[PDB]
Amino acid sequence: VWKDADTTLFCASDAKAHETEVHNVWATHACVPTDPNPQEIHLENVTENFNMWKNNMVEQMQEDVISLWDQSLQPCVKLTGGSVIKQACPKISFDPIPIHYCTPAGYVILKCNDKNFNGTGPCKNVSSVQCTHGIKPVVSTQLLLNGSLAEEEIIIRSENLTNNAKTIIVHLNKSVEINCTRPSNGDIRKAYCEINGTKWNKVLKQVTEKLKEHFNNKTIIFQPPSGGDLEITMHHFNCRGEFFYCNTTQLFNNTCIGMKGCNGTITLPCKIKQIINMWQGTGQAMYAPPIDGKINCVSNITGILLTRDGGANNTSNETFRPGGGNIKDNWRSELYKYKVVQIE
């Protein structure tokens, strides 16, 4: 016998004590070793309701990642409100590692294994585990990176699809590589991401076909963001400790979906920025210029964050723009199939 409850989780990882890389240092202190023998138990004839948007595990992961960045990526200059803090800001070794979330004694985690589960409602194929799978705390906007993939069809996730203030998460079932480089020396802040146009456009066509299912076969259109901070109007992420901002206008190109001059490599222009708005929500930070040499991150695009235009009530089409900003949604994109219960 069990019931929905919230409690204090602990983390587990394969972090290395000798490693200088910052996620490793954090997890060596904060976490235990990965379950040497993970076993999940299928709950026969059991149906359980889930709600990925009201899942306190997400809150706890957000706290960890904020704590990790706070002690490893402190800005040389922090501007919060009007007060200026100056502190050291050495370059670091930075590359996210998988972190598992695990329940304390007297609690367990239920896991939804329905292959087209959208994050809310009833789940027919349920199992219990002691820990989630290993989740990398990748912070990004617009595109979800290095995450897990939908196993069957592309899945659309939203707390309320008709609520245009709610972010939509698209969960891909096939990843598309994005290859971002700041070349070794020259503008030291000029960088770019390369994506295979053919692959990306095929996926994006399937995404529109899935979206059509949720909006009455209406015409689906992508457009670039209409406003906001650069962290959200651009694909924002951290590669090797450096903050990237990439322009995704070419990535959401309707002309290609459905013409053929699109196949080929898509080169998005990016810039490294020393002065950023902190996704933590805590204000403006200023870092030192980028390290020398070839700065390169190849990532899997496994998800997309979207905002749908209002004012389309009695129109023939629906318009989507890349979104993000609320990093808790990043963790939701991976934690969606889990919930904590207390064993009575």
Partner: antibody, heavy 125, light 102 residues
């Protein structure tokens, strides 16, 4: 039911631009996730114009016309939200309200618990 | 089609009586309700369909029958005579004008 503060009403010639501003206390702005703008034309109903998220400056609008002509921004340091309207038309004469939506509304839709007193904009030559 | 239909357009009642207003929505969705007096901004009364806002007296209630969302004001006071609007997401109802019957 404290009120949000708004700039004073005024008259604008057709085709001009205007900025309407909305500010409040640090505590309130801190507990505001979105600032919405809603207008009411004389003797008519309420019409949603758009929103801006206070934390990220993200926006959305009630129509292409609004997306085209209205800019929604905020200044987190001064706990203020701005609505810039350009190409003012006679159809834009209305009282414009700013209104607040809290964090964590979950699945219970849109409800604005604090409102500004409204700014009358009269478009006339 | 129309997303919200509010009724009645007008309602005439005596103080102490109970008013029943409805907003019939095309789709299910938590309903909000405002009071609106001339020269003053909307005042939140009910949200999440049936939850009362802070400081709102318990004579104001909200509920629903299927897609028919309803606002009830029992034992009306003078101060309660005004216009009333429902809001579901970005859409507002046409409004109900509640005036004193004599």
């Amino acid at each position: 039911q404290v009120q949000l503060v708004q700039s004073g009403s005024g008259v604008k010639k057709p085709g001009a631009s205007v900025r309407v501003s909305c500010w409040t206390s640090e505590d309130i702005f801190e507990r505001t996730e979105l600032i919405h703008w809603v207008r009411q034309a004389p003797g008519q109903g309420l019409e949603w114009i758009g929103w801006v998220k206070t934390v990220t400056g993200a926006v959305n609008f009630g129509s292409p016309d609004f997306r085209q002509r209205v800019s929604l921004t905020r200044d987190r340091d001064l706990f203020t939200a701005h609505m810039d309207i350009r190409g003012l038309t006679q159809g834009d004469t209305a009282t414009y309200f700013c209104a607040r939506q809290k964090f964590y509304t979950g699945g219970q839709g849109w409800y604005f618990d604090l409102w500004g007193r409204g700014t009358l904009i009269v478009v006339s030559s | 089609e129309i997303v919200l239909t509010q009724s009645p357009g007008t309602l005439s009642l005596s103080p102490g009586e109970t008013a029943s207003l409805s907003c019939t929505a095309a789709s299910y969705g938590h309903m909000t309700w405002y009071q609106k007096k001339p020269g003053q901004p909307p005042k939140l009364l009910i949200f999440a369909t049936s939850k009362r806002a802070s400081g709102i007296p318990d004579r104001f209630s909200g509920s629903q029958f299927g897609k028919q969302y309803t606002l009830t004001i029992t034992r009306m006071e003078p101060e309660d005579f005004a216009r009333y609007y429902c809001q579901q997401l970005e859409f507002f109802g046409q409004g109900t004008r509640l005036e004193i019957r004599r």
